[model samples]
Target: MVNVAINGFGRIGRLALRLMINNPEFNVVAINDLTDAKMLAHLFKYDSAQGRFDGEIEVKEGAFVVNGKEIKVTADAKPENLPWGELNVDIVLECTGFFASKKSASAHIAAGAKKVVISAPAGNDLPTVVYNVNHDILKAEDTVISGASCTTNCLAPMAKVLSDDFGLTKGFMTTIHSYTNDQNTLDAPHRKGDLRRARAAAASIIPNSTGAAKAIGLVIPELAGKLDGGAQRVPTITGSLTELVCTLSKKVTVDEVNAAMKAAATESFGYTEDEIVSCDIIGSSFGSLFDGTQTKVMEVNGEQLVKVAAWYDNEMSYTNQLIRTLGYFANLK
Candidate 1:
């Protein structure tokens, strides 16, 4: 089994831990988070959004025992100070969303981690892997990698299918996402250029920008600069939706577009249907669940304009990809 350590026990980090504990291929040796070990145990035991775990979790002096595994836990917030070498961790999953630079990611290596996988998008120079989209291109030499964001993971697979089938020209995306830890619970001070995130996080639908459009091109380079869009942080807790609007080279029917999505599901990692809601796709294995019912196709000027929606569990779906990425890099000789 590949020994792993997570450097930020937030939404994505905790979810990845839960998945790792159940899989025999992984062994979580240690974890680093800002929360206290006791609080971490409680949070893992009872999540209001993802529900409860059946197994037992006990917080000891310097470690927590989940199921039958006793793992080291630390509250260190700095990347360079974490004891990755002492814990004998093979890979570190960085989920803090605070460190996006290649230098910060490589800091894990300097601290003695064999590899580092950022849970969100990393610097432009680093390789970003969306499991079903560009995972095959990942190399063993790529020590510092990015798992991409939940939006990019959902958008890339669907975009790849549509772009490959109908020749995509230009497009826009809107991700209706759940509130994250970065947002303030009530109105408060925020960083510069982040006015929207400072408002009441739970009481409003906050309009925000996403890097998914440009990040998608990292996997499908032909669509670089051809896509542009943003996100809206909704009141929901876990599940989110992605809306893609595009103009293709030729006119197509709604049925044809739906057929293309379904074909993509069979060929890659997504699903299609005439009907499905956001909540219905919470635990789905696919990166995106394309809603055929909401699909629209129209002829504008000379090109085909298409609009479609895809649903994903912001926590679970992205964790699934993270686990897959770990496995891919673990077997490298």
Candidate 2:
């Protein structure tokens, strides 16, 4: 089993650990979070969004005994201060969302982690991967990488299918995303000082800009500068969806678009014809669930315009994709 350590026990980190604990390929030997050990354990025991963990969790001796496995826990503010070298941690799941650059994320390597995967879109300098879309290109020499954000994960697979099948020219994406910790719960000053996010979270529809479009080209090179879009943070707690409007090479019918999406479904991408809502996507293992019912085609002034949508559980879907990438990256030797 590959030795793994979670750098932050937040939403992604906790979910990743929960999924990895039973998997035969991963061995989570330690966790490094700024929060107290007991607090982390309690959060793991009972998650509000993803539902209660199915396994046992006990806080003992400043560590977590999860299903008979004792994982060393630490509250290291800096990655270099962690005992990763001493623990022989092979891969560190960088979920803190703080160290999100090539140089910043390499601190895990300096502390003796054999490999590192940042949970957010770091930048163009480092490899940004959407598991099934661009993860195959990852080389063993690539010591640090970014598991592109959940929004990017949802857009890339669907966008790839469109680009590969009909030859994508340009597009705009609108991610109907769920509210996040970055947003204020009530009307107040946001930490990021964004007026939109400073409003009430669950009570209002917040329109915000997303990096998915800017980062899509990092995973799919052909689509670089061809896509631009933003996000709308809605009242949902977890599940979110992506809407893409594009101009394909040729005019195609709605059925053809849906068929193409159906053909591209994989472990990371899903397809559904049923009229499913956002809540239906929670806990899905797929990174993106292509909604066939929402596919539409338009021909205006002899130009082929297409619109498509895909749903994802912001927490679970992204976590599952990150886990897949984490395990795949762990074996690079």
Candidate 3:
């Protein structure tokens, strides 16, 4: 079994553990967070967004018991001081968002963990993977890698289908995303005091920038510099939408675009024919859901401009991708 440890008890970390708890390939040996065991257990037992966890949560001394399994839990703000070495942990999921850089996350290696997978963007220097899109770039020698952003994961797979099938030239995305933990409920200073994000999050349509459009190159490579876009934070707290408009090499119809997305469907890249909204994708296991109902094609004198929408649960979607990539990374020789 692959011994896995999680370094945060936030949405991604808890969700990752929840997914891998019964998986045959992974044995969750330890969990680390700045929060205490009692609070962590409480959060695990009672989540506001994801709802109550299914199993029993018994808080022991320094660790917690989940359905009789006593996984070690600790509050180590500094990862280098953690017991990853003593625990013989194979991989540590870096969900804290603080240790996103390779140099910072590699401290887990310094602490003796065998490998690291960061849940946020780690830049171009390290592998930034979206499982089905670019995880093949992962090698046995890779010790630390990026899981990319939730937006990036949702964008990459959809972009791949377009670029490969229609010969995409350039695109711009307007991610109608949900407000995240970084945004504040009240009009107080938050998220490093970004003026827009600091405002009451669910209160307005706040314009924001995203790296996914430009960073698509990291995952698809061929689409580098061909995509550019940003985000608009809406009232909702979980689900998100990627409204993408692209210019392809050849003219295409709405049905053609939908058919292309249909053919590319997978567990990571999914397709939906029903009329759905952001709320409908609250707990989806798929990283991206191509909404067939939202496909649009505008042709101007034989040149095609296509519009497509993909729905995703930013929290669960990316966490699911993270676990899949981690499992694959661990099994590779």
Candidate 4:
């Protein structure tokens, strides 16, 4: 079995570990974090709040077991301090919620792992991998791979399908995303541009900035300056939605766009059928989201523009895809 170590045992990290534990080809042998061991105990529980598969996934005092395989923990948040190589970790998935660059990602290699994959798009030049649109950019030599943000992953294919199938020009996106750990459960201190999002998450809807527009530039570089997109932090803590409006040069019918999306699903994702919903993919620790078949893609103003909707579990599915892509790289090598 190919052993991989994951740094950061938060939302994405823990969920990704759940998937890896079940897979035969890849094993999550080590987990690292910077927290008290007792507080870090929950990393072993993969089931939902109701406790469905609690015992099926073992959580011993110091280790977690998946299908009887023990995954040991060495909780060190600092990259330089983790004993990744000692555990025979082939690659380290940095889910630290920080977007580190190739130079920074290379530090993992310097620290002892062979390769590193950042959970989000970096500020520098690593190619963003959106399974449907740009998985081809992933290469073995590429030490640092970015899964981009979940919002960016969902929008890339949307933008690519619109631009390629129908002549595309301009577009704007408003994503109604579920709250993440970054948001406050109650009102908190304003952090510069974060004032709008400082309100309690469950109290009211909050308008916030999205990095999708800026990050999308890494995948579909043409749309960087051309696309305008932002986000709103909704009350829900799980699934998220993307609303897109675009002007198409050609008179593409709704069926054509829908057919193209269906084709895109078959071409790229594992769960790409017309029936998958945001709720279905919520606990799907795999990667990517279901096709929003109910999504409207209607031509307006004499068939000049089209609007579309897509859904995803921003944290779950996004990182699930990150692991899938990393496993793909390992398999290809």
Best by lDDT: 2
Runs in model 2 deviating more than 4 A are: none
Q: Candidate 2's residue-wise lDDT over 197-273, tens digit each?
A: 99999998899988888767899999999999999999988999999999988779999989988988899999999
Task: Kindly list the per-residue Cα lDDT of model 4 for residues 285-308, writing each as its tens digit.
Answer: 434343545545554455565777
lDDT of each: 0.82, 0.90, 0.89, 0.70
TM-score, per-candidate, Cα-based: 0.93, 0.98, 0.98, 0.88
Tell how far residue 170 is off in model 2, in angstroms: 0.7
Once model 3 is optimally superposed onto the true structure by TM-score, how far is the C-alpha of residue 229 displaced, in angstroms?
0.8
Ranking by TM-score: 2, 3, 1, 4
Q: In candidate 3, what are the lDDT values of residues 219-300, reduced to their tens digit?
A: 8989989999999999997999999998998788888888888898899989999998888898789999999999888877
Q: State which candidate, 3 or 4, has the greater TM-score.
A: 3
**Which number leads on TM-score?**
2
Per-residue lDDT tens digits for candidate 1, residues 31-52, read 8888878877888888887789
- If ranked by lDDT, best first, what sequence of candidates would result? 2, 3, 1, 4
How well does candidate 3 score on lDDT at residue 120?
A: 93
What's every prediction's RMSD, in angstroms?
Answer: 1.9, 0.9, 1.1, 2.9
Worst 10 residues of 3 by lDDT: 189-198
